[PDB]
Structure formats: C-alpha cells, structure tokens
Amino acid sequence: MVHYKLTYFAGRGLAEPIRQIFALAGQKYEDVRYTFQEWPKHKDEMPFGQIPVLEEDGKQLAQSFAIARYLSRKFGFAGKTPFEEALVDSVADQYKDYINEIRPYLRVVAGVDQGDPEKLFKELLLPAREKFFGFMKKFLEKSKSGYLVGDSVTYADLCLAEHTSGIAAKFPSIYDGFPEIKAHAEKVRSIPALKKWIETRPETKF
Amino acid sequence: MVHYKLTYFAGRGLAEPIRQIFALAGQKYEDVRYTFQEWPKHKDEMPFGQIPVLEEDGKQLAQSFAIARYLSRKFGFAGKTPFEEALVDSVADQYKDYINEIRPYLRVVAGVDQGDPEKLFKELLLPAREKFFGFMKKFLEKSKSGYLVGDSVTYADLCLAEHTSGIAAKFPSIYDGFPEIKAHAEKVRSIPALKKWIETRPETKF
Ligand SMILES: N[C@H](CCC(=O)N[C@@H](CS)C(=O)NCC(=O)O)C(=O)O
Ligand SMILES: N[C@H](CCC(=O)N[C@@H](CS)C(=O)NCC(=O)O)C(=O)O
C-alpha cells in the first residue's frame, strides 16, 4: 500500500496544514520530527537542504505549499473547479506573503532567534495582520460559506485557521477587530477529523 | 470567445513568465501596463491591492504564481503527471524563495529603493544564486533534458530563464561557475513562439 513520510521539526510550523490534510483524508503517514539539534546533519538528504519534505513511495517532494497542494488535489481539498483551485492558490500565496512579513516574530517564538515575542507581536504582527485579515474578510464576504473559497474546506482554510489559532493561544488579541477570522478558525477546527487530530497532536510551542 | 486580460506595470518583473505562457500557447490576451505613476488609482480594484492580476471573462485572479499555474495547467506547461506537476511547483517555490532573498537588490535596480546595486549584487545576489543555482543544477542533472523538471518546458523554466537572462543583461557574471544555467536560459528562450515574443516585447528596465 502507498507509504507517505513527512519530515519536519518537532513543531507545527510549515508542516501542520499537511498533517491536517492527512487527518481529513483519513490517510495514515509516518510523521518524522527533528529537534533543532538533530536536524542539520540531515540537510543534504533534502532536495533544497530544507524541510518539510514529503516522501511518497520513496519519491521526495519538497516545499510546504507544493506538498499541501499535491495532497489536497489527491484528497479533495484543493478547490471544486479549476478556477476555484486557482483562487485557493492565490489566497495561499497571499498567506505566504504575510508569513514572510512576520518571519522575525515566528523565528523568535520558535526559539530560533533571540527576542521578545510580545514586542514583535505588537510592532510587527498586529499591523501585518490588519492588512492580511482585511483581504481574508473580503474573500469570506464573497464566499458566504464561512470558508475562504467556495463552499467547502480547502488547504488555504487549514493554513489560516492553524496560524490564527496558534498565535491566539499566546496572544488572543490577534482577533481584535476581526471576529470573522475567529469565526473561521473555530468553524475549520470543529470539522470532526480535524478536531480529533487537534485533541491528540503533540503540544509544541510553534 | 474566451478573453484574457493581464494587468501589471510597464516592465517584465512578475508578469513576464505569464506573458510567455500566452506566447507559447498562441493565446491572445489584453496586455495592460501601468507606469509607477498611473498605478495608485487602480490599487483598490485588485484582490490584494497588488499586481499582476489576470481576468478571465471578467473574473479576477491575483498572485503571479497562481496565475502562472492556472494558465500552465490549461495550456500544457504545468508538468505531465500529478507528481511531476508537484515537482514543478516545488522548483517554482524555491525560485520564489530565492527572489525573496534578493528583493533588496531587485528593488534598488527597479529604483523603488535607494542603494548601491554593485555592492548588493556582490554581497547579496552572488551568494544567493550560488546556493539556488546549485539546486537548479542538480535538477537539470536529474532531468537530462535541459529543462528543470521532465523533458519539456514548464512555467518553472520560464521563471528561471527570464530571471537569469534579465539579470545577465547588466551583470552577466551571474552565470559565473554556472555554464549549465546559461545553457538553460538559451534553450528556453530559443523555443520559436518564445524567441518571437522576446524579439518583439517592449524594452524595459525591469
Ligand atoms: N518555502 C519554504 C521553505 C522551507 C523552510 O524555510 N524550511 C525551514 C523549516 S520552517 C528549515 O528547513 N529550517 C532549517 C534550515 O533551513 O536549515 C516552505 O514553505 O517549505
Ligand atoms: N506574491 C507576489 C506579490 C505581488 C507584488 O509584490 N506585486 C507588486 C508588483 S511586483 C506590487 O503590486 N507593488 C505595488 C504595490 O504594492 O502598491 C506575486 O507573486 O504576485
């Protein structure tokens, strides 16, 4: 039977939406998790010297969004029509831009860089999310479904719900001014197979 | 009949691989270009207040890679199999990461940022491309086709060839230590429909 392996750090980070695609699909996989200490010696194993990396029957696929889209297309979470799949991609790409914007914050919370999460949250994340959540609000207005694109859950939903809920665990004011984005996280995370995964996944700081 | 519009600045930049997909496909489109000056009055029309943005029969799709993939799937430049398509995505996502890395350099040459382009080329671009072209070289070694993934052009190839060609016009030392990357740009840009587009496209600074 097909074998999937996901390799990433011992954390949610860029791998988490991929783990949630597997959960929604009811698809078993090997969840390989590295400490920051163990990781470096495995760098040369990976297509771009980075993680996450998926293996399917021993074939490697790098890049978290390439991996998310590949599995979402296979399992029914990519969008309902070719144009909708593209709309899903555009939202995911806007999310990726936002994450790039807040990278200094994420590196600090992950323990990778030294810093004050609270200060970065206020100075960096709040203004970045004001712009970002503003566009997400627009997509939700258009959909009228509670999901970002179309009438059913996609990997773009998983990315957003995971991010916002993850930050809100530490800094709940992320949702201030944006009750729609809170509603979205709680809608997505209550999908039964996801709710079960969230109940049982390792507790990690990032 | 289907109608496409592409809106971007008066330049190659993020829109150019998309223009090249249309050229390869033999597909007519409305090519709309704004100078830096003319853009602000149009910002709020756009899904994320950024360009490029595609319209297909009046439906907007933003985000350059989402646009490129959508058109590539439609026209035969996305990859031949679902796994190859994902591999193509992964290369394009590494490309995007590289472009992010050299953003400070790009912004100076486009004139958006103030700086020393020669200094940034040597201190930022050369070390970034050494890592990135290293991975691209391994991909070309695997394909044995002259293309990054599989045996025919994909939008990933267009991205790389447009980038390296475009830099090389000013700083041809980008190809130093990477003859295979120069060969790749030459191969891609020699494809007939593309060669013709390159011959006729507006001459722009970026
Ligand atoms: N475009 C990114 C690149 C992945 C990335 O920045 N990888 C990090 C994981 S959060 C990593 O490998 N960190 C350790 C290292 O770069 O050596 C993606 O979405 O996968
Ligand atoms: N993730 C990018 C973002 C698009 C972007 O940075 N667009 C620039 C043009 S290169 C822009 O609209 N700049 C003008 C502005 O933001 O007002 C993409 O691939 O499309």
Numbering used by the authors:
A (entry chain A), B (entry chain G): 1 to 206
Q: What did the authors write?
A:
The structures of two major GSTs, Na-GST-1 and Na-GST-2 from Necator americanus, have been determined using recombinant protein expressed in and secreted by Pichia pastoris. GSTs are homodimers that catalyze the nucleophilic addition of reduced glutathione to various diverse electrophilic substrates consequently facilitating their inactivation, and extrusion. The fundamental/active units of both structures are homodimers with the classical GST topology of Nu class nematode specific GSTs.
Monoclinic Na-GST-2 contains an octamer in the asymmetric unit, corresponding to a Matthews' coefficient of 2.8 Å/Da and solvent content of 55%. Although no glutathione was added to the crystallization mixture, unambiguous density for a glutathione molecule was observed in G-site of each monomer of Na-GST-2. Apparently, Na-GST-2 usurps glutathione during the fermentation process. The side chain glutamyl residues of glutathione face the inter-domain cleft and are stabilized by hydrogen bonds with Trp 39. In addition, the glycyl residue in glutathione forms hydrogen bonds with Ser 64, while having an inter-molecular hydrogen bond from the conserved Asp 97 from across the dimer interface. In the Na-GST-2 structure there are some ethylene glycol molecules from the cryoprotectant solution lining the surface of the H-site.
